């Protein structure tokens, strides 16, 4: 089973002159989008991003929607507030971000609670691990730190992260666990490409795997290469699955000395592959 997380990522973006700030809430269950609220619409509402959430009733949606609209307008003020703290123009576009949530163990219990803020892409404030105190990241933030102290919000948010957060996380995994546990194994193969002089390039591809977590290695006679092995970041196929490769420059004629390994969670055992010339 392993641990689990319920996380919300929120974005408030002012675009002065062009209308109201774009507001966005995305919810994740175990790093998997499952709800979204997007203010850019005539009647915005919270909405299911995974079919297993359609199991929840119009009552639930209404209630999350109303919360989100509240949060939206509150963040709208926060944007005007922040201009003040920072002595900034009322003309520029600015961004507030928030990441907050809870992760629990296999036993359903709270491993960790957190909430962190960022303005224009830099850390702003955060609830410390002790779920009771704040770390302000700069001087403007100290104003909020002291404001959130003089209003006891380190205790109010402590109830959420330990109570409703954890509880709903259990309700969520309940209906989504069969889909969440899904696994698509990588299919791998090695391509061969030229190179100036007496060198060639060997590329190990891994395609169609979920989730994105994967590991590729190259071996010269049983020993990982590290040094000057090239790779790309894991990237989406666009269809729910992922892609990675790793490549080595080897000597022409010495290709059969090299072995590629694919470690993924869906595999009965790591794949082992060789360049094979048809």
């Amino acid at each position: 089973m392993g641990p689990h997380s319920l996380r919300y990522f929120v974005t408030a973006v002012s675009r002065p002159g062009l209308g109201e700030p774009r507001y966005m809430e995305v919810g994740y269950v175990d790093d998997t989008e499952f709800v979204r609220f997007d203010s850019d619409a005539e009647n915005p509402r919270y909405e299911p991003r995974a079919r297993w959430m359609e199991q929840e009733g119009p009552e639930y949606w209404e209630r999350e929607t109303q919360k989100a609209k509240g949060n939206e307008q509150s963040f709208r003020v926060d944007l005007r507030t922040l201009l003040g703290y920072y002595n900034q123009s009322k003309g520029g576009s600015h961004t507030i971000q928030v990441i907050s949530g809870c992760e629990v163990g296999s036993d359903g219990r709270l491993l960790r609670g957190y909430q962190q803020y960022a303005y224009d892409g830099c850390d702003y404030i955060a609830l410390n691990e002790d779920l009771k105190t704040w770390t302000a990241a700069d001087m403007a933030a100290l104003i909020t730190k002291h404001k959130w102290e003089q209003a006891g919000e380190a205790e109010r948010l402590r109830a959420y992260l330990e109570g409703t957060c954890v509880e709903w996380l259990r309700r969520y995994l309940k209906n989504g666990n069969a889909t969440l546990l899904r696994t698509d194994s990588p299919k791998a193969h090695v391509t061969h490409h030229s190179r100036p002089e007496d060198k060639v390039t060997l590329r190990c591809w891994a395609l169609g795997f979920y989730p994105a977590d994967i590991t590729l290695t190259w071996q010269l006679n049983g020993e990982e290469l590290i040094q000057d092995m090239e790779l790309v970041e894991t990237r989406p196929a666009g269809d729910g699955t992922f892609q990675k490769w790793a490549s080595v420059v080897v000597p022409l004629g010495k290709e059969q000395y090299y072995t590629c390994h694919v470690y993924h969670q869906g595999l009965p055992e790591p794949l082992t592959l060789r360049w094979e010339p048809p």
Partner: peptide, 8 residues
């Protein structure tokens, strides 16, 4: 589900 965020 979601929390209400405090003003900054």
């Amino acid at each position: 589900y979601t929390v209400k965020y405090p003003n900054l």
